[PDB]
Amino acid sequence: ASYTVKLITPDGESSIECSDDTYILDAAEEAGLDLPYSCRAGACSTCAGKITAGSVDQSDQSFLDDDQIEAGYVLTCVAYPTSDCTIETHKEEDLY
């Protein structure tokens, strides 16, 4: 049951469909979104995306702790958008 996943970017606004048992990144790169990712597995902050218009599940990540997720930075390389959401890519520098 894929849901409308809004991927905000400085080069425009796209909308990819991601499943609950899939990663927002894979669904993005698969379409050609070309998001800021490196490990694309779940062990960084470059894939993190400021979220504040939906919900996701990142119980596989190994970078964030509690303050990061609180802000909204969700690793797209390991996020499970159970429902519609609006991940704001290009939001990792906040940490570094």
Binding-site residues from annotation for [2Fe-2S] cluster: 39, 44, 47, 77
Alpha-carbon separation of residue 46 from 1, 4, 63, 68 (angstroms): 27, 22, 10, 12
Among 16, 77, 79, 87, binds Ga ion (CB under 5 A): 77
Structure tokens, 41: 């597995």
The reply on whether position 39 binds Ga ion by CB under 5 A is yes
The reply on whether position 7 binds Ga ion by CB under 5 A is no
Structure tokens, 68: 């990061």
- Nearer to Ga ion among residue 39 and residue 95 (C-beta): 39
Structure tokens, 19: 């499943």
Task: Find the shortest distance in angstroms from Cβ 31 to Ga ion.
Answer: 18
User: Of 50, 37, 61, nearest to 6 (Cα)?
Assistant: 50
Number of residues that bind Ga ion (CB under 5 A): 4
Residues in the site for Ga ion, rule: CB under 5 A? 39, 44, 47, 77
